[PDB]
Amino acid sequence: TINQYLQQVYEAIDSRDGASCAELVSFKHPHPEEKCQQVLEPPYDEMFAAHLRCTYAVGNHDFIEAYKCQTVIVQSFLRAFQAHKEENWALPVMYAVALDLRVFANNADQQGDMLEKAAELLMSCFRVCASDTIEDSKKWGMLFLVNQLFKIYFKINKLHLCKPLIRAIDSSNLKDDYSTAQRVTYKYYVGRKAMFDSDFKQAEEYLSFAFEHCHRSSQKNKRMILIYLLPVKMLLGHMPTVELLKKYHLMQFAEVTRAVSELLLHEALAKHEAFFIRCGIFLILEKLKIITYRNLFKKVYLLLKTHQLSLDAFLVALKFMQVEDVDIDEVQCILANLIYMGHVKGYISHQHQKLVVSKQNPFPPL
């Protein structure tokens, strides 16, 4: 019972195995102050007494009160984490506690200021692991302490704090040698901001790294990276298949992948517009106006089939689409945008009001 548990703490402390002590302090097991204080070192004396207090507060359903006990645990662990001079047996113990505090912030929100007060100490756990300066180093769990701040600061939406946290990890020697669960969770988040910074190519290498190495057993984590890849893909022009969307049972993009393949887009957009202002999606997903414009150019080019095409016909093809007040200056403006961005070759002549497209390679493939 409690004495067998405490003898397990004694064996975990004396044999310095951090995986076993991380397993005993977690809630993954089935598994107050004087019994923990009569035998342990004074940071570990407060540590496991507050672990027992957190277990009793879970059993009381007092999730506000459990959070401050689970603050006393990690402050005592940080004081014990100071006490090991150039040694890192206690580094798997941190994954047992700093993963917990995030969700123990969330329940303390229910019964976000409390997410904030949880979010200011995990900064200091990053400070301690970033202070030490390879096989005995204390920096192996640094990137775990950036993937617990990133799962707080997108639930409050603060972005300006997290541009030395990217700079600390990205300028490091051991950044390509972390654990493979955390190095692919992180590579999503810095990819995700790279969608919102109009720097899509930086997000192209990362989330495709996040999609390809995601595990089979958790389909939801595959689905979320699929959701956030689908704006940055098909702006590049990846153009998914029906079988992918049927396999992940996510079929709302598919009609859009009809309308982006060749107004249809506005009707299919406003039919389910409440999904695309739910995950930060619609104002990203409107920017394929300029590639669906090239696909409508392909539809006019394949149906009229000569080199020089008059602009009145593309004006007619947009007057079918019928959104808001299209004229002849708007047509030639967005055609000039297509012709310098690189999607459409040729030149615009104003003397005859005809567009010449390229003869041997008409619209270059992306």
Partner: protein, 374 residues
């Protein structure tokens, strides 16, 4: 004289400051009780040391105008924590302080503009910093912060050809960003309590119009309240935002003419960026190669790019490498080099039917307030 009274009641202010000696919530923010428009101290202090506001003085010079002579800011690392009841005035006096500024000084009868901007600017920063210090949460004073916001948005166009000793537009833009940010921190905490606004989407449109070059503002458009997301001012703002990033200038300058007056000068903040991208795109578009040039007419470029006459368009068009001849411009790929003083574009200032103070008020002016400071 005023000097001996200055020394006597400065001495009383000092020994009253020695009569007080600190926790998070035990010391309440302590609303002050001073009623007049410029304490009782500061007018005499500025009278002896010749720091006189050049508009509001008695016109025989010498005597400070005791009925009206408004305060200046002075960030000075003031070791005094901004006095006690005095120098910080309670909430009904703030509305009168803004009301006297919309009533008479922003309709300036005679005088220069350099002293006029400093006179109205350094005051409106004083009301802003004092409502910041005072810690008041009311729907009335956030409208006054929006009044200083509309004043800053109006002065972002009204003085642009003024000298660099007078305006220096960067610190004005850095102030006007913090104005609308004080609006956002005010109204998030106000909407979380459950108090809505009559004109929320107007300055949310001002916020979206202030940050087109910042790409994150797209995501900010997601987490609005759907009433203010579906409002017409924010829907003008998003359609204005989808003309930079897709680089559509014809639609952009069609949305200038259909805009309000105060939106048009925020569209004049991005004045030289749009036609730089437009003259890059049209020169790349209309040229078959890099060794010959094609004729573009002047009527098309003054129709598309909002240029109010031929002379401003031709000045912009020869100060970029191209050459204007008769009624045509020779668009050339090779001679387009990136190398100007900004101006007053008349199509914004013709969209103001009301007078200047009635622009800042956004409606009917109150009657002139009369006060007797004794």
């Amino acid at each position: 004289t005023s000097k001996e009274k200055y020394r006597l009641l400065d001495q009383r202010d000092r020994i009253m400051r020695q009569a007080r000696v600190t926790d998070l919530d035990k010391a309440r923010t302590f609303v002050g009780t001073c009623l007049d428009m410029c304490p009782e101290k500061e007018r005499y202090m500025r009278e002896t040391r010749s720091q006189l506001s050049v508009f509001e003085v008695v016109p025989g010079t010498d005597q400070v105008d005791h009925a009206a002579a408004v305060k200046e800011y002075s960030r000075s690392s003031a070791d005094q924590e901004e006095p006690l009841p005095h120098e910080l005035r309670p909430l009904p006096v703030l509305s009168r302080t803004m009301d006297y500024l919309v009533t008479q000084i922003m309709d300036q009868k005679e005088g220069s503009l350099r002293d006029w901007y400093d006179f109205v600017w350094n005051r409106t920063r004083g009301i802003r910093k004092d409502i910041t210090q005072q810690h008041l949460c009311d729907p009335l004073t956030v409208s006054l912060i929006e009044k200083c916001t509309r004043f800053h948005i109006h002065c972002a166009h009204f003085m642009c050809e003024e000298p660099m000793s007078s305006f220096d537009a960067k610190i004005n833009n850095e102030n006007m960003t913090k104005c609308l940010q004080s609006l956002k921190e005010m109204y998030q905490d106000l909407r979380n309590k459950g108090v809505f606004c009559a004109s929320e989407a107007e300055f949310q449109g001002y916020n979206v119009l202030l940050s087109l070059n910042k790409g994150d503002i797209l995501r900010e458009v997601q987490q609005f309240h759907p009433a203010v997301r579906n409002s017409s001012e924010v829907k003008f703002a998003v359609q204005a935002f989808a003309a930079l990033n897709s680089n559509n200038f014809v639609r952009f300058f069609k949305l200038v003419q259909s805009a309000s007056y105060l939106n048009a000068c925020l569209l004049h903040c991005y004045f030289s960026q749009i036609r730089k991208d437009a003259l890059r795109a049209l020169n790349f578009a209309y040229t078959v190669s890099t060794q010959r040039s094609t004729i573009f007419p002047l009527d098309g470029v003054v129709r598309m790019l909002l240029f109010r006459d031929c002379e401003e368009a031709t000045d912009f068009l020869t100060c970029h490498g191209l050459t204007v001849s008769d009624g045509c411009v020779e668009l050339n790929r090779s001679a387009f080099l990136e190398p100007s003083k900004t101006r007053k574009s008349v199509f914004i200032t013709r969209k103001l039917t009301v007078s200047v103070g009635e622009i800042v008020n956004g409606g009917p002016l109150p009657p002139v307030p009369r006060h007797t400071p004794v």
